[PDB]
Write a protein that binds this ligand. Structure first.
Ligand SMILES: [Mg+2]
Ligand SMILES: [Mg+2]
Ligand SMILES: [Mg+2]
Ligand SMILES: [Mg+2]
Ligand SMILES: [Mg+2]
Ligand SMILES: [Mg+2]
Ligand SMILES: [Mg+2]
Ligand SMILES: [Mg+2]
Lengths: 175, 109, 201, 125, 139
RNA sequence: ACAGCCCCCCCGGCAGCAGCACUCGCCGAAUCCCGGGGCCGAGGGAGCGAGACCCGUCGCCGCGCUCUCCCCCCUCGGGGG
RNA sequence: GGAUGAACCGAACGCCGGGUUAAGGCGCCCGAUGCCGACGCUCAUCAGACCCCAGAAAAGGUGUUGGUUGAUAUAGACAGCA
RNA sequence: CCUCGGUUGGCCUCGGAUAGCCGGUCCCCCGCCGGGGUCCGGUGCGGAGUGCCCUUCGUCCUGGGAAACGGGGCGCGGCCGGAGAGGCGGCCGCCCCCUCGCCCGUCACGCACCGCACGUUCGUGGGGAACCUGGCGCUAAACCAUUCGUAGACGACCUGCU
């Protein structure tokens, strides 16, 4: 599974009815995927792992994107996941700050790739939850819980290094 | 009276790493360093003006040493403001790093 | 362009500036790099000195007089770095190499001219402030260059003369500001045109 | 610019007293249209000013096949009195509208050129 | 050393991006790289925004963090940030850049003439002052 | 409280609406118009009709007018409804 | 395209013009990121840098970064001094 | 004449810092100019290279402003600065010009070559043979041959010759 900016999908599926149970149970999952095709594929992967279901023996009755119910509010996200390292499988709890749940999960995927070299096929997101600022455990997240937060931008690197490419004046980094 | 043409540099031919398509040339127009700035110069006439030993007839003038290979800008090349040019005859390789004039002629402004 | 592009080597990173210069001279442009002893190299000095000492070790075993020519002046070091980014075994590459001049210090043709700066090669923006770096002049001096002291003395004389010239320029500009204040009733008519069209805030 | 003719060629006159450009045809592909305009509505462009009026005239080569004697005569194009009258008639009512706006006549007297720092793709015309 | 700080109510100028050339207020801070940003009077709806495309100004508004558009807009309108911004040397430098960029050929000609005459008058005055200062004779 | 924030409300009202305040999609029988740059111009007797005669302005397709009559608006009979 | 290479990756071939791609790339050699690309990790006095492929293991590190489990602490932890 | 072609306005300069800079000014110290301490300004650099300067249609009537302590001299003579590769720059004295050149106006004229390209500069370009025209100036060495033997396979080298 590749990535992009991930989206949350509510995927509901069920086994096909048989003359053993005319109404098989419906199962719902949250899948964070680039698009609905990958979302359906990951739904089948996960329900094959959990229940004894297959894409051939079952069907997907709903697959719809879940829009964030408050994208204008900064909030803390705790994510419980598991992943395969080069030498085993580990459970992790990670914390992020973002406006959207899908953005937080994307942050998680990038951060796992950056810190643990974990590719997206190795990572199994098993719980995402908005948490109160008192329930946070990661100091890098907790340090932004200041009602009077204040910091400068110390050493501002010139990013327009080629417009102009040649110039007489040397850049200023203090602003 | 004045220059009346934009300066450009014959940077090289359209090419892969190990193949060279001499029929089309790459021009670096002075002051155009982004792809979105190249839209003005598309379709403009361009000239490679040089001197030789024998005199050749000059339109509206006396024969002199000046010779021209005419051409025009066809499209943009790269993100950094290159352009591609097609000339009436393929540009000689001694002209690489030399002056090309973009003549403003087929004006759209 | 058509003029000579004069670049000050102080505060610039070696390979970044050399890539810029190589592309410029391949585009048929005259380039002159002055004060090549002020060029910086990222990474600490011992590491960069070790790299140059490995370069010194690489020599032709049968006849070292034919082997790699290890140039010890900072200008020649930068010249060889640019040659490493130029296709110097063809006529186009040799002409591009000819279009480049390199100097230690600033010689009299160029000490009286303004000098450009390449931000994409500057240490201050290309290098994190906590990282270490080496000076090309110091590295050259400790690997075999002989003219670090005399170049420093001549640079200090050049700086004294430049300070005098800058004081004269400041005094002239102060006098110009006073002149603009002196004549303003006969100037405001054109000052308003300039202000209207955005020149002269 | 005064009017497009029947062949699509523009008829122009930067008045001859300003920059020595008579009533003359030009191609719209080979001109740059600037933003500055003068209201030349309700001026009277004479009706006879047409493509056939401005078409070039040629003399050679009747009653002469083999050239042994030079036929370079008449190469001096002569300005017609009719053309001079037409130029006077147009300029007499173009010029007062030019003078009505400050230092437009100097703008029309000067010629366009590309300074080394300026680029036509960033120039607003 | 530092005088301009990232903080709630700080007014920032957008250098580039979709909202370039606009003023915004910093409503909240997100993970050292982004800020919840709101221009209610400068037509920038609330959104995340990186600190790289911000250039902090000297104006600080007083509203609590993560307040609504109403309170941000009242803080902006009372002690009007639009006129106080336009009065600064920064804003009119931007405006001068814009009107120099949008200048036509006739305008360039007129600027050339006016600048020619202005420079000649100033240069004559400079020569006069130089000769007036050259008459010094004092042991 | 001399600021605010979140949820449920007894219920909302107005505008706008994947926004022309560039927050976040998939699309077009639920889709059309206009413009620019580049390359190209292969083919050569298409006439069922007059019994062709100046080189077939022809087939398919899409249209307009007349073989009816009233009006209306500009030009000085022409043009537009 | 992999610098180079019988076999790898893409793709198979009449002579050409235009458009677009594949695998692979876009500091300079060398066409193309001269994007105001995004988030982190990392300093190496043998750094690292792309299938085949052209060099490495067990074992360690109070280097730094994440994570798991457990424990102590205003009924005053921990570390220092007595 | 022969040949080689490029190019198509210039920037005549602080040192530098980057978790900071720049400009200006009153008191202390060193030769009337600089260095400090104040104080006042600017800082997404506006005393800004995203900049500055010059700006080319030419003339003729013709007025108002800028100037008139002004511009030109391939005109002479004198001085000074510059040595890192000074190959450059600046200042005076005499003489000879025009009151023109810069802005806004008045006035008409120039081949207006009948739509069309290589136009426009550096430029009196570089280089080579040759003719004419004047002025001011110069009258030499190297090599072979010979000799040496501090040298030597041969060349080369060290030497001598009214
Ligand atoms: Mg819509
Ligand atoms: Mg044909
Ligand atoms: Mg190959
Ligand atoms: Mg290989
Ligand atoms: Mg395969
Ligand atoms: Mg092709
Ligand atoms: Mg490559
Ligand atoms: Mg390239």
């Amino acid at each position: 599974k590749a990535s992009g900016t991930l989206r949350e999908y509510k995927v509901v599926g069920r086994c096909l009815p048989t003359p053993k149970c005319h109404t098989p149970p419906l199962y719902r999952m949250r899948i964070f995927a680039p698009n609905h095709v990958v979302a359906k594929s990951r739904f089948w992967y996960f329900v094959s792992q959990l229940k004894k279901m297959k894409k051939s023996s079952g069907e997907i009755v709903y697959c719809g994107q879940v829009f964030e119910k408050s994208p204008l509010r900064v909030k803390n996200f705790g994510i419980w996941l598991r992943y395969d390292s080069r030498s085993g499988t580990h459970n992790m709890y990670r914390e992020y700050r973002d406006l959207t749940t899908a953005g937080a999960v994307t942050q998680c995927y990038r951060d796992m790739g950056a810190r643990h070299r974990a590719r997206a096929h190795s990572i199994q997101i098993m719980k995402v939850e908005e948490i109160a600022a008192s329930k946070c455990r990661r100091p890098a997240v907790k340090q932004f819980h200041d009602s009077k937060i204040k910091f400068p931008l110390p050493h501002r690197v010139l990013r327009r290094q080629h417009k102009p490419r040649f110039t007489t004046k040397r850049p200023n980094t203090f602003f | 009276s004045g220059r009346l043409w934009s300066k450009a540099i014959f940077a090289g031919y359209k090419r892969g790493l190990r193949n060279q398509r001499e029929h089309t040339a790459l021009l670096k127009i002075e002051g155009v360093y982004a792809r979105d700035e190249t839209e003005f110069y598309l379709g403009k006439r361009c000239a490679y003006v040089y001197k030789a030993k024998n005199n050749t007839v000059t339109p509206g003038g006396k024969p002199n040493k000046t010779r021209v290979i005419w051409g025009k800008v066809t499209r943009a090349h790269g993100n950094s403001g290159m352009v591609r040019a097609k000339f009436r005859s393929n540009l000689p390789a001694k002209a690489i790093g030399h002056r090309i004039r973009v003549m403003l002629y087929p004006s759209r402004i | 362009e058509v003029q000579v592009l004069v670049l000050d080597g102080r505060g610039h990173l070696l390979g970044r500036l050399a890539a810029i210069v190589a592309k410029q001279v391949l585009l048929g442009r005259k380039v002159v790099v002055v004060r090549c002893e002020g060029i910086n190299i990222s990474g600490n000095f011992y590491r960069n000195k070790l790299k140059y000492l490995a370069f010194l070790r690489k020599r032709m075993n049968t006849n070292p007089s034919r082997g790699p020519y290890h140039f010890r002046a900072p200008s020649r070091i930068f010249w060889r770095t640019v040659r490493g980014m130029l296709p110097h075994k063809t006529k186009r590459g040799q002409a591009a190499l000819d279009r480049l001049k390199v100097f230690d210090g600033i010689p009299p043709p160029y000490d009286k001219k303004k000098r450009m700066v390449v931000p994409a090669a500057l240490k201050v923006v290309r290098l994190k402030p906590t990282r270490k770096f080496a000076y090309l002049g110091r590295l050259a001096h400790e690997v075999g260059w002989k003219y670090q002291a005399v170049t420093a003395t001549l640079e200090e004389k050049r700086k004294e003369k430049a300070k005098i010239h800058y004081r004269k320029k400041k005094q002239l500009m102060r006098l110009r500001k006073q002149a603009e204040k002196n004549v303003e009733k006969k100037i405001d008519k054109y000052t308003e045109v300039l202000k209207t069209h955005g020149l002269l805030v | 610019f005064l009017k497009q003719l029947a062949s699509g060629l523009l008829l122009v006159t930067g008045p001859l007293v300003l920059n020595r450009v008579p009533l003359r045809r030009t191609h719209q592909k080979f001109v740059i249209a600037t933003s500055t305009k003068i209201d030349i509505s309700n001026v009277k462009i004479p009706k006879h000013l047409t493509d056939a009026y401005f078409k070039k005239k040629k003399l050679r080569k009747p009653r002469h096949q083999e050239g042994e004697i030079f036929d370079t005569e008449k190469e001096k194009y002569e300005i017609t009195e009719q053309r001079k009258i037409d130029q006077k008639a147009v300029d007499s009512q173009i010029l007062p509208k030019i003078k009505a706006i400050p230092q437009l006549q100097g703008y029309l007297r000067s010629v366009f050129a590309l300074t080394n720092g300026i680029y036509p793709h960033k120039l607003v015309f | 050393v530092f005088r301009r700080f990232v903080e709630v109510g700080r007014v920032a100028y957008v250098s580039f991006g979709p909202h370039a050339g606009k003023l915004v207020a910093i409503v909240d801070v997100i993970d050292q790289n982004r800020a919840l940003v709101d221009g209610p009077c400068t037509q920038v709806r609330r959104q995340a925004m990186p600190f790289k495309c911000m250039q902090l100004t000297d104006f600080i508004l007083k509203f609590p963090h993560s307040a609504h558009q109403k309170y941000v807009r009242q803080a902006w309108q009372k002690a009007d940030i639009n006129t106080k911004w336009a009065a600064t040397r920064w804003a009119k430098k931007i405006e001068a850049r814009e009107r120099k960029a949008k200048m036509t050929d006739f305008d360039r000609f007129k600027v050339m003439k006016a600048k020619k005459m202005r420079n000649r008058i100033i240069k004559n005055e400079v020569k006069k002052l130089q000769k007036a200062a050259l008459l010094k004779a004092s042991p």
